[PDB]
Amino acid sequence: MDKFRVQGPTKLQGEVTISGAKNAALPILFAALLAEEPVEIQNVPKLKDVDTSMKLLSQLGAKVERXGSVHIDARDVNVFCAPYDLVKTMRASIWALGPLVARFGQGQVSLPGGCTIGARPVDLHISGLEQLGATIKLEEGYVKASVDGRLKGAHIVMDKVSVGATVTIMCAATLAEGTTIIENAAREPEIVDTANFLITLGAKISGQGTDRIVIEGVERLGGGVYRVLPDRIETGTFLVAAAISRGKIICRNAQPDTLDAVLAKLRDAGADIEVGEDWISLDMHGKRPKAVNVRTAPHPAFPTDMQAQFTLLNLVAEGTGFITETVFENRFMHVPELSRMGAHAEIESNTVICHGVEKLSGAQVMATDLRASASLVLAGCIAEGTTVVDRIYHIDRGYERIEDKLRALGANIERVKG
Amino acid sequence: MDKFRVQGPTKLQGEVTISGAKNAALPILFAALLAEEPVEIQNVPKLKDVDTSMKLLSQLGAKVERXGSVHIDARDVNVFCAPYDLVKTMRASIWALGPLVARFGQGQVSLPGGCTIGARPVDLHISGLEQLGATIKLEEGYVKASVDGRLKGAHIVMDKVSVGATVTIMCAATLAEGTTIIENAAREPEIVDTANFLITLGAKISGQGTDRIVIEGVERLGGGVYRVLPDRIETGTFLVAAAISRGKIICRNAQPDTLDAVLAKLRDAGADIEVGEDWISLDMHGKRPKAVNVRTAPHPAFPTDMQAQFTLLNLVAEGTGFITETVFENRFMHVPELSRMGAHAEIESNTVICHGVEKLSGAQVMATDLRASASLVLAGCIAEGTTVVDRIYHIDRGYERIEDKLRALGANIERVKG
Amino acid sequence: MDKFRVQGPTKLQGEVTISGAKNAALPILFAALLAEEPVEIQNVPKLKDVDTSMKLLSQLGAKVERXGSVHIDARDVNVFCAPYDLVKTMRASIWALGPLVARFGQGQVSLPGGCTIGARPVDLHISGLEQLGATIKLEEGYVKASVDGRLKGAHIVMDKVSVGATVTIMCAATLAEGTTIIENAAREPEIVDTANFLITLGAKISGQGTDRIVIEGVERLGGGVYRVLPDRIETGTFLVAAAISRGKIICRNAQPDTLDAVLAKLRDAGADIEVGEDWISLDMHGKRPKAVNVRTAPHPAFPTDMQAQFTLLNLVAEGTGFITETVFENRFMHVPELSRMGAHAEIESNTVICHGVEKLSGAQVMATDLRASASLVLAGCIAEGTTVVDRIYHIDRGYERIEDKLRALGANIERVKG
Amino acid sequence: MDKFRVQGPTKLQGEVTISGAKNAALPILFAALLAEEPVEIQNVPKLKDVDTSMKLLSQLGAKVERXGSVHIDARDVNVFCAPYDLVKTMRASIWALGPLVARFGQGQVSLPGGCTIGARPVDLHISGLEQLGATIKLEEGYVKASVDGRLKGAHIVMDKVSVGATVTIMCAATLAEGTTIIENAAREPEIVDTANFLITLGAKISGQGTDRIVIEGVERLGGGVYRVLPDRIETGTFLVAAAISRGKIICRNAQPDTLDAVLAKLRDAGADIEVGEDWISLDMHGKRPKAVNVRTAPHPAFPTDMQAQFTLLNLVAEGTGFITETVFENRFMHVPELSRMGAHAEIESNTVICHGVEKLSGAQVMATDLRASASLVLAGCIAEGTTVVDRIYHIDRGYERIEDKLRALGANIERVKG
Numbered sequence A, B, C, D: 001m002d003k004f005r006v007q008g009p010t011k012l013q014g015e016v017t018i019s020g021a022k023n024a025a026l027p028i029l030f031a032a033l034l035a036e037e038p039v040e041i042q043n044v045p046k047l048k049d050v051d052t053s054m055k056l057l058s059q060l061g062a063k064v065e066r067x068g069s070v071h072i073d074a075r076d077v078n079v080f081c082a083p084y085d086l087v088k089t090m091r092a093s094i095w096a097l098g099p100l101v102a103r104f105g106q107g108q109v110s111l112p113g114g115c116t117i118g119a120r121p122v123d124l125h126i127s128g129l130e131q132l133g134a135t136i137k138l139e140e141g142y143v144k145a146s147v148d149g150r151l152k153g154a155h156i157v158m159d160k161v162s163v164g165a166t167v168t169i170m171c172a173a174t175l176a177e178g179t180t181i182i183e184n185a186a187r188e189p190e191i192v193d194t195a196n197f198l199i200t201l202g203a204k205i206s207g208q209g210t211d212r213i214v215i216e217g218v219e220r221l222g223g224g225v226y227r228v229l230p231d232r233i234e235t236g237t238f239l240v241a242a243a244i245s246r247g248k249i250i251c252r253n254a255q256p257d258t259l260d261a262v263l264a265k266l267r268d269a270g271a272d273i274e275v276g277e278d279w280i281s282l283d284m285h286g287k288r289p290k291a292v293n294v295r296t297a298p299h300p301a302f303p304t305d306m307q308a309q310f311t312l313l314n315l316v317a318e319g320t321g322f323i324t325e326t327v328f329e330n331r332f333m334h335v336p337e338l339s340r341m342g343a344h345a346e347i348e349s350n351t352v353i354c355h356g357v358e359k360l361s362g363a364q365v366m367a368t369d370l371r372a373s374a375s376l377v378l379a380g381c382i383a384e385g386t387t388v389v390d391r392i393y394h395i396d397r398g399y400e401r402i403e404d405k406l407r408a409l410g411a412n413i414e415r416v417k418g
C-alpha cells in the first residue's frame, strides 16, 4: 500500500517534464497484439499499469521488454486468455479481447469487477464485438469471444460515449472485412493516438478525434515505432499544483491542444498561462486561486480525470465553486479526506459545493483511486504541517515518479514504510 | 488476506442461531463510557468491530473483558482521544465522542474519512452535540468537543434520519441539564436497544422506537447488565440464504418484529414464512424465488443492510425486479461481482434493474464491504462450480462465524489463507 | 382566468387566523362515505378542493351541505363511481375507492393521471385494498374494485411512506372483518385527525401518528361531529410571509406541535419564534432572513408542502442555501418564475442551489400549482414594484381567503379578472 | 385546448411526407433578424410556433408573410423588445435577443417562463453574449442586453451542451468584430441548418455539426432563399407509429443521416428499415416490437425529443426495457397517462422501467407537452377502444397536420371540443 509523508506549506515552482499518456500507452500496448512484425512504443511511462500490461502481453506469448521505450514482438502470440490475477489489477486489460478476436478468431478475458469510482460495465465493448461478427459468452467469469470466420465491418452507433469501447471496436475493426463506422465515438486524444499508432501498422482509419470513425479492414498489420503523446492529465495535475501553491510551473514535453477546457478553467481561476509548441507555463504571481465552476464530460470538454484536482483547487480557492461530475457516479471520495484537512465542502448528488479556505492543515488521509491519490499529495504539499497519504499504490498506477517530479518543484515528500 | 473458497450448487437448509446485533452491541459499548459502575453486556457477537471497540475502550482507560458477554468498567476512563489508527478501522468510533463530552466535558475523535459505500459525514452528530451546548472544532483531522461543565438539554429536530447521530445525541443527552427532545429520530431497533441499555444504567428516556425521543438528563449513570437484541440483518442474511437456494431455514434466537419489511418481501418472493416469539422459519418448497421491487429506507422500511442480499435474490429469481437504494449512494459494488457470476443487472443511478437467471456460475470475486461480502458468499453457495470471494476480512466485521453457520446449512465453504 | 396584482415591497404585519387543514378536511370528507348516520365536520376551510369533494359526494348520493362546517349524510349513497371528469380536477378523490369498497363491496374511481409536481402513482392504494381482499382491475381508465361480502383485515407492510395510501387502507380497514395492521404508516397529523374522525364514528383504531396503525373492523359506522385540526401548511406559509418581509406575525388557532421542523428552520433563519397552547408568533426584528438547508421527508420532518415557500426564503435570504426535495420529483416549477423576479437559483438534480439576493423585482409570473402560487404571491409582497400572478385558481384549491389574510397583514393585493 | 378522439386499434400503414423541421425553421426565423435584405425560408411547416415567431417578428418591425414559404423582410426592424405576452407562449423567442444585440446594439426579451419538462434556464445564452461583449441586466423579468458598437469575437467554452445557447452565440457572432470560437457547441442537425442559412446570407461559419464552431464576423448579412431540412422528430414519430402498430410506413422528404441513433434503436426493436437519399421505410412485418433500452443525450445520440414515443414503444413491446432521460429533468409526464391506458411503467428518478403489454385500452388522457401529446395520439391509434387526448394544443406547436398525416396511414382520428 505504502505512504507519502508530505510536509507543507510548500510553494511549487520550476519545471517538470511531462510523461507519455498512460491512457495512450495502454490501449496502444494491447493494439500491439494486432502487429505481425515487431513494434516499438516510445515515450512510455514507467507505471504499474504498464508493467501489468507487459506481464499480460508476455502471458499471451508476446516477447516484451522495456528501459522510455517498450518493445513488443507479438508475432508468436499463442495464448488467448488474460488470467484473472492480472485483469483484477487492471480493468484496462479488457482491451486484450478485441485484438485477439480480430487476429486469432478468439479471445478470453476475465470480466472486470467492481470499481470504486463507478461500476464501469463493458457492455458496450462486448456488444460492439458482436455488431462486428463475434459470438460472445461468459463462463466462469471470463468473457469468451470467438469469430469462426474473420471479423465483419459494421455501422455501429454507440449508445453511450465510451473511450474504452471506442478503442476496442476501432482496434478490432482494423482486421475486419469491409467498412466499420462508429457513430457517437469517443474523441479523446488517446484515441487519436491509438488510431495513428494503428495507421503506422498500416490500418486504414478516418476521423479519429471526431464523433465518427471510419475503419476499412486490412489483411494484417506490420510493425513500426510510435511515440505516445504527452499525458494531459499529469500535465493538468502539475499545472493545478502550481495554481494552488501560488506558484509557477513550466511543463515541458507537452501537447497544449489536448487541454483547451482545463487551460480555460485555470485562466478562469486567475492563472497567467502561456503555451508554446511543446510546453505550457503557469504563474500565479504569488496569488491564491479564484474559485471556478466545473462540469465534467467527454473530450473535448472538461475531463473527469482532472475533477479531483480542481475540487482541491476550489477548496483552497477564493469564494465558492461547483464541481459537477457527469461521467463517473462515485468519484467524490477525495472530498471526505480533504475535509479532514480543513476543507469546507458539501456533496449534493454529483455536485460538490466548495467553499475555499486559505490553508489546509496536515492530517493522515486515505487515497481511494488514482486521481484522488495525487490530489491528496497536492493537498499535503500546501497544507500546514505533516500530511500522510496512505494507499499510495493508487498513484503508482498512473504517475511515473510523482515524488521526484514534485520534489523538483520544491515539495517535501518521503515515501514511507507502510 | 484470507478468502472463502465456496463450492456450488448447494441447497441451504436446516437451522441457525442468531447472534447479538453487531449494531446494538457497538453503540452500547460506547454508551458504557457513560457508566460509573461496572457493566456486563450479554449476547455480544464475537466480531472484529467489537474487538476494535474493545481496543478503543481500553485505550481510553476502561477495563474491558469478554468471553457471551463483554464486561466494561469505565470508572477510570482517563484518555479522551479516539485516535486515527482506530477510527479509520471503524468509523462507528465516532460514538466515543458524545459520552466523553457528556461525562468529561471534553472529547476528541478522528474525523472519519470517506467510506466504500458512501461519504458518510458526521455533520449531524456534530451539530446535535453543538445544540447540547458543545463547542466543536476540527484541528489536525481531530473532532474536538468541549463544554463549560454540563451539556444542556435541547429540542433537536434532526435534518435527516441518522441512526448514528440519534445514538450520539441520545447518549450525550443522558447527562445533560434538563430535557432533550430528538425529533425525526431514527427508529431502528438498535436505538430501542441502546435506550433500554441506558435506562438500565439509570437514564430517563422515553419514545425510543419512535420519531421523537425524550431524554431527562441525570447527574450520573451507574452500572448494570443488559442483553443485546438479535441481529436482524444476520437473520435476514440466512433467510435469503434459504430463499435463493430453494431451501428451508429456522432461525433461533430471532426477534421477528424487527423484520416486518424483510419478511413481507420474502413472502412477496414466494417464501412460506412462520414466526414464533423468538424464531422465524422460511420454506421455499423447492421453488425459485419470484422477483421483487425493493426500496431501502430507514426502519421500519426495508433496511439498506439487506439490500445487497436481495439484489442477489432478485438476480436468481423468476422475472425482473428493481432495488433502489435511498440510504447510501454507493452500495452497488456487489453488482459487478455478481455480474462476473452470470447475473444480469443494470445500474441506473440509485436503482439496480435485475433480470433473474436460473443459474449463477462460480468465479473469482472481490468482497468490497460487509453486506456485499456475505451476498458474494451466498452467491458462491448457489452458483455452479467454485467461487473464490477475496477480502473476506469484511465479513469478519459483522458476522459471527458465518462460515460455520453456513456449513451447518449444508454449505461447502473453506477459509483459505493465500 | 383570475390573477393577483401584487405591489411591494410590503412588510407583513399583524395576525392571521388559521383555517382548518385542507389535508384533514379532504380525507375526512371521503371517510364520511363509511358513515351511516349524519356527520358534521367543523372548521372546514372554504376551498375549491372542498367544493369538489362535496360535488363528488353529492354525485355518489350523499346529501351534503356547508356554511364553518360541512354536513354529510351518506346513509343513501347509491352510485359507486368517481368519474374522470371530477378525478381529473382533484386526485384526492382516489379516497372514495376504499370507503365504497368497504361499505358497498364495489367502487370505481378514474385512475389519477399525471400531475404538475410528479407522476404520483396510486399503486400503494390498490395494493393495500388488494391485501384487504379486494379484486381490482383497470378498464377504460377506471380502477374498479370489488369484494364478496366485507373486506378482511390484514398485516400490511407499506413499501414507501404514503399519506394517501395510509388513509385509504385505514378507512377501508374500519369495516373489514378482523384486524388490520398498517406498518410503515405515514404519521402526518392529518392521519391522526382522520383516525380520530373514524373513532368518533365507532371505529377501533390505535397507533395513529406512529408508524404502526392497528384497526379492529366493526360492522357499521355511525355519525358524529368532528372538528378538523388547524392547517399547518397555511400556518407555515404565513410564518414564511412574515419571515421574508421583515415582519412580525401571530397565527391564531394554530397547533404548534405540527410544525416542529418548520419552526426549527425558521429559527435557523434567525426568526424569533414563541409558541402558545394554540398560537405561534414570529418576529424577525427588522431582519431579512438567513439561508438554510432543507430536506423534505414525511412528517415529523420538514414537509414537502412548505418547500416552495422556503425556497422563496432562501432566494431572498442573505447566504447560500439548498432545498432538497425527496417527496415530489418535479416540485421546482416556482424556481424559474422567481428567477423572472431576480432570484439567483440553480436546480441540480433534486436540490435547488439558492444564492439569496437582496431584492426581488416585480414581474408577470405564472402559478403552476398550489404551493407554488402561494410562494409567488408572497414573492410579490416583498418584490419592489408590481407583480402579476396568473392562474391564481391554484391558490383557491388550498387557501381560504389568502388575499384577505394577506391584506390584513398589510399586503397590497388585488384580484383581477382578465 | 380542443381534443382528439381516437378510435383504435389501427395498424398504421402507407406513406407520409415529412415537413421541414420545426427546430430549424425556428432558429432560422430569428436568425433572419440579422438580414438586411429579404429572405425566403422554404419548407417551413405550418405550426403554432411558426405563427408565434411570425407574430413576434412582425412586432419587432419585420415584414413577414407565409402560404410552403415564410417571407421576411427585416430591413426596417425597429422594435427591440420581445414582450412577455408573446414569449410566455414560446421559449424559443429567447432567440430574438442575440440578433437584436448583434445588429442593433440592443435587445430585450422576457426571461422564460418555467416549463413542464424541466426548468430550462437561459444562463448560457446570457453568458455567451456577455462573453461577446454585451452588458446584460434583468429588469422586471426582461433580459435587457446592450453593446456599444459591434460585439467582439470571443473564444467561448460552453460548460454544458445547449442547442439554444449554441444558436444564440453563433448568430450573434456573425456580426461580431473578429473571430468567435464555440467550444462544446451542440452538434444538432438544426444547428448545421441554421449555420448554412447564415452562410447563405454571407456569414463566415465553419465547424457546424462539430463540437467547435468558428465564426469570422462580417459587416452585414444580406438576404437569400434557404430550404429548411426535414423534421427528424416528425420522421421518428411516424416511424414509431409504424413500429408500435405492427404496420409499415414510408417517410418521404426525409434526411436519413439525422437519425442514426433512432434508426439503430428501431432495428433493435425488430423493425426492417430501408433508407434512400430522401426516404426511410419501416416495416414491422406484422410483429410486435421488442423492448429496447434507451439513453437520451445530445445529438448524435438518441434524442430527448424521441423519448416519450419510445417510452410508448417499450410500453407495448415484448419484454422489459428502460428509458433514461439525461437532457430534461422532468420529461415523463406521458407515463402516468399511459398508465391510465394500462401501461405497466415504473419511474425511478431519471429512468422509466417499461414492461410492455400486448394491448393498451382507450381512455381519456391529457397531453402535457408537445412530444407527449404526440405519443398519446399514437397510443390512441393502437389502444383498444376510444382515447380522447385533451390539451392537443401541444401537438399543434410542433406538428403540421398530424391528424391528416395519421389518417392517411389509416388512423381513425376526429378533432373535438369535448
Ligand SMILES: [C]C(=O)[N][C]1[C](O=P([O])([O])OP([O])(=O)O[C][C]2O[C](N3[C]=[C]C(=O)[N]C3=O)[C]([O])[C]2[O])O[C]([C][O])[C]([O])[C]1O[C@@]([C])([C]([O])[C][O])C([O])=O
Residues within 6 Å of the ligand: A023, A026, A092, A118, A119, A120, A121, A122, A123, A124, A125, A126, A160, A161, A162, A163, A164, A165, A186, A303, A304, A305, A327, A328, A329, A370, A371, A398
Ligand atoms: C485506461 C483508460 O483509458 N482509462 C480512462 C477511460 O476509461 P474507460 O473505462 O475507457 O471510460 P469510458 O468507457 O469512457 O466510461 C464512460 C462511462 O461509460 C460507462 N460505460 C463504459 C463502457 C461500457 O461498455 N459501458 C458503459 O456503460 C462507464 O461506466 C462510464 O460511466 O476513460 C475515462 C473517461 O475519461 C477516464 O476517466 C479513465 O482513466 C482513469 C479513470 C482510469 O485509468 C482508471 O484509473 C484514470 O486514468 O484515472
Ligand SMILES: [C]C(=O)[N][C]1[C](O=P([O])([O])OP([O])(=O)O[C][C]2O[C](N3[C]=[C]C(=O)[N]C3=O)[C]([O])[C]2[O])O[C]([C][O])[C]([O])[C]1O[C@@]([C])([C]([O])[C][O])C([O])=O
Residues within 6 Å of the ligand: B023, B026, B092, B118, B119, B120, B121, B122, B123, B124, B125, B126, B160, B161, B162, B163, B164, B165, B186, B303, B304, B305, B327, B328, B329, B370, B371, B398
Ligand atoms: C455501526 C452502525 O450502526 N452502522 C449502521 C448505521 O450506520 P450510520 O452511519 O449510523 O447510518 P446513518 O447515520 O443512519 O446514515 C444514514 C444516512 O445519513 C447520512 N448521514 C449520517 C450522519 C450524519 O451525521 N450526516 C449524514 O448525512 C449518511 O451518509 C447516510 O446516507 O446505520 C445504517 C442504516 O441502517 C446501517 O447501514 C449501518 O450498518 C452498516 C452499513 C455498518 O457497517 C457501518 O455503517 C452494516 O452493514 O452493518
Ligand SMILES: [C]C(=O)[N][C]1[C](O=P([O])([O])OP([O])(=O)O[C][C]2O[C](N3[C]=[C]C(=O)[N]C3=O)[C]([O])[C]2[O])O[C]([C][O])[C]([O])[C]1O[C@@]([C])([C]([O])[C][O])C([O])=O
Residues within 6 Å of the ligand: C022, C023, C026, C092, C118, C119, C120, C121, C122, C123, C124, C125, C126, C160, C161, C162, C163, C164, C165, C186, C303, C304, C305, C327, C328, C329, C370, C371, C398
Ligand atoms: C390531498 C392530500 O392529502 N394531499 C397531500 C398528500 O399527497 P399524497 O398524494 O397523499 O402524498 P403521498 O401518498 O404521501 O405521496 C408521497 C410519495 O409517494 C408516491 N406514492 C404515493 C402513493 C402510492 O400509492 N405510490 C407512490 O409511489 C408519490 O409519488 C410521492 O412521491 O401528502 C403529500 C405529502 O406530504 C402532500 O404534499 C399533499 O398535499 C398537496 C401536495 C396537495 O396538492 C395534494 O395534491 C398540497 O400541496 O396541499
Ligand SMILES: [C]C(=O)[N][C]1[C](O=P([O])([O])OP([O])(=O)O[C][C]2O[C](N3[C]=[C]C(=O)[N]C3=O)[C]([O])[C]2[O])O[C]([C][O])[C]([O])[C]1O[C@@]([C])([C]([O])[C][O])C([O])=O
Residues within 6 Å of the ligand: D022, D023, D026, D091, D092, D118, D119, D120, D121, D122, D123, D124, D125, D126, D160, D161, D162, D163, D164, D165, D186, D303, D304, D305, D327, D328, D329, D370, D371, D398
Ligand atoms: C426550439 C428548439 O430548438 N427546441 C429544442 C432545443 O431546446 P433548448 O432549450 O435549446 O435545449 P438545450 O439548450 O439543448 O437544453 C439542454 C439542457 O441544457 C440546459 N440549459 C440550456 C440552456 C441554458 O442556457 N442553460 C441550461 O442549463 C437545459 O435546461 C437542458 O437541461 O433543444 C432540445 C434538446 O434537444 C430539444 O428538446 C428542444 O425541442 C423541444 C422540446 C422544444 O419544444 C422545446 O424547446 C421539442 O421540439 O419538443
